[PDB]
Amino acid sequence: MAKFFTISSSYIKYLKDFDDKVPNSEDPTYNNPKAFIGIVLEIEGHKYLAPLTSPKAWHANVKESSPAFFKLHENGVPDNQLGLINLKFMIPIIEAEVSLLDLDSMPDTPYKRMLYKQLQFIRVNEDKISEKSKLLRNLALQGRMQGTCDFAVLEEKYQHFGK
Amino acid sequence: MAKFFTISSSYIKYLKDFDDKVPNSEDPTYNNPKAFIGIVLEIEGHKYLAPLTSPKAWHANVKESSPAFFKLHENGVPDNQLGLINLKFMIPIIEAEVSLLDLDSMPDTPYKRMLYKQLQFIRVNEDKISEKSKLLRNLALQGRMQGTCDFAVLEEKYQHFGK
Amino acid sequence: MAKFFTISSSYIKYLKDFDDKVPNSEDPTYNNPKAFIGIVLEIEGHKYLAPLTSPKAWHANVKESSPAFFKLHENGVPDNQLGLINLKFMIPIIEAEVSLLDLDSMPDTPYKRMLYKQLQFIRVNEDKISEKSKLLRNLALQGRMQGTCDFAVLEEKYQHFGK
RNA sequence: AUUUAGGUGAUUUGCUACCUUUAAGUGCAGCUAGAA
RNA sequence: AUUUAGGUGAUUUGCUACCUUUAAGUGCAGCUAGAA
RNA sequence: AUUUAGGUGAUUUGCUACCUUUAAGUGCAGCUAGAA
């Protein structure tokens, strides 16, 4: 619970073949790799990682009640917005295709300090994040969320990676 | 719980014959009929409605611990005092002799807006109001309350109205 | 629980024969006898009383997590420090050798006013004090606390007092 | 309309919390700055 | 009188919370304003 | 990257709380100062 991961580009491409909403893993504008938080949900043998995303203007219109997102901010400093967990684009993973961020070897950077500020807030809210993940998947499967990842198709296809 | 009612004048007079502390229900001074809130208590098959009453000076001396009263005020605006529920003068009712207020059809008036501000506070505290009503009846029957309605005689006599 | 006691000087000196850290009980400079609070711990048939002690400079360096002490202050007035319960020098007692303070009949003095402020703060924290007492004894017996009373020796020896 | 129930603190002014003789003194404020 | 137990955070300055080597990082403040 | 799920209030503007059609309206703010 509450660990940062990166995901192999080839696994991302494999999943993208079946669902184009799977998060982008390559972009020349990315300063660091796409970080995921996990494991946000473990259900029916599937382990899910959810992508982190930096602030965007439309994040202002996100209601806390939406399980598609978990808004992040510094513990006790709500004005210090730290992006959000984009649960609506979480994906099931093969453990061979994911790797923990090597925080204790990464050099001291503004990004690493932000990662730790995010981590404290996530750890304190782990149960809320898992509840939102479970609810979001459940509603999306029933067609009661719009434009999330295709959890049925991803759960049907992901284990055929490399096979 | 937390609904506004009016009570037939004949039922009120019937009960008043057995207990003169039964609330006055009609008066030319009334801008609106005497409103009751209910059902505040259901015990031994008897359903109780409690009268609302507008501010009086002596209400300032009412302590929260007294189950004879439930002071009302606007949610989050304690200085906007809205009278009280006079639990000590609650009465058991016959369903045929009471009527819901027709809120969804009543014309919009300042009185109706006040009713809604009262209703919100009552809804939020419905459990407390019910606890106070039960406690008040229990203490009054043991003779440990001051000048309440005579719940024993009222429960003995009320069902024989019209029979 | 949460009662003030004095302990007979002979019992104190008897225990001091086996453990020199047992609190000094009389000193010509003392305005009042050394007051104890109890019963803070009841374990394996032993009843424990803990000495109260007035402020010392080093009390500023005491951390709340230490079960060796329970700092006292006026309820809701943290700046009004009232010394501490020195649990690390608590002792098992023989009931015949302890006496309640005569709070009912003692004349009103500033010391008695302070005693009552201490009593309120202790009463509100009774469970916390008992937890600290049990933990401190447990850790001291394992050598995980420093310079407390010798609870093993005191519990072995206290009952042969007077025989 | 019907004009404040009694209690819970070795102590308790106001409000509050709590209890309903089948069971309960918490929190805030005020005052207090005592001594081991 | 007797003059600070050690820990719990992939990170943690103060205090607090939590745990008692079988375990456990909460909250406030401080600093931080990073980027997918 | 991927640009707000729908509901819960005899009433409900924003946010929040709550519920996941098996169920659910709390809190803050705004407005209101009504009368038995």
Q: Is the C-beta atom of A53 closer than 7 angstroms to strand E?
A: yes
Q: Do the beta carbons of residue C36 and residue C66 sit within 8 Å? A: no
Chains contacting C with at least 3 CB pairs below 8 Å? none
CA distance C163 to C158: 11
Radius of gyration of chain C (CA): 15
Q: Would you list the DSSP string of chain B?
A: --EEEEE-HHHHHHHHHH-TTSPP---TT-SSPPPEEEEEEEETTEEEEEEEE---GGGGG--TT-TT-EEEEETTEEEEEEEEE-GGG-EE--GGGEEE--TTTSPP-HHHHHHHHHHHHHHHTHHHHHHHHHHHHHHHHTT-SSS---HHHHHHHGGGTT-
Closest CA to B129 of B66, B81, B74: B66
Q: Would you list the DSSP string of C11-50?
A: HHHHHHHH-TTSPP---TT-SSPPPEEEEEEEETTEEEEE
Q: Do the beta carbons of residue B81 and residue B55 sit within 8 Å? A: yes
Q: Which residues of B140-159 are buried (b: 16+ CB within 10 A; e: fewer)?
A: beeeebeebbbbeebbebbe
Nearest residue to F9, CA vs C1'?
B120
Q: Is the C-beta atom of B144 closer than 7 angstroms to strand D?
A: yes
Q: Is the C-beta atom of C154 closer than 7 angstroms to strand E?
A: no
Between CA B15 and CA B23, with CA B18 as vertex, the angle to 5 degrees is 45
Is C161 exposed, middle or buried (CB count within 10 Å of its CB: 0-12, 13-18, 19+)? middle
Q: Pairing state of beta strands A46-53 and A36-43?
A: antiparallel
Phi/psi at B71 (5° precision): -65, 140
CA distance C116 to C109: 11
CA distance B94 to B38: 13
Q: Do the beta carbons of residue B159 and residue B94 sit within 8 Å? A: yes
Q: Do the beta carbons of residue B55 and residue B101 sit within 8 Å? A: no
Take residue A67 and report the two structure tokens written for it. Answer: 């399980």
Q: Do the beta carbons of residue B149 and residue B16 sit within 8 Å? A: no
Q: Which residues of A122-158 are buried (b: 16+ CB within 10 A; e: fewer)?
A: beebeeebbebbbbbbeebeeeebeebbbbeebbebb
Question: Whole-number Å distance, CA C140 to C1' E19?
Answer: 17
DSSP code of residue C51? E
Radius of gyration of chain A (CA): 15
CA distance A90 to A133: 8
Q: Do the beta carbons of residue B145 and residue B68 sit within 8 Å? A: yes
Is C67 exposed, middle or buried (CB count within 10 Å of its CB: 0-12, 13-18, 19+)? buried
Domain that holds residue C28: 1-163
Please count the structural domains in chain A. 1
Closest CA to C92 of C24, C4, C161: C161
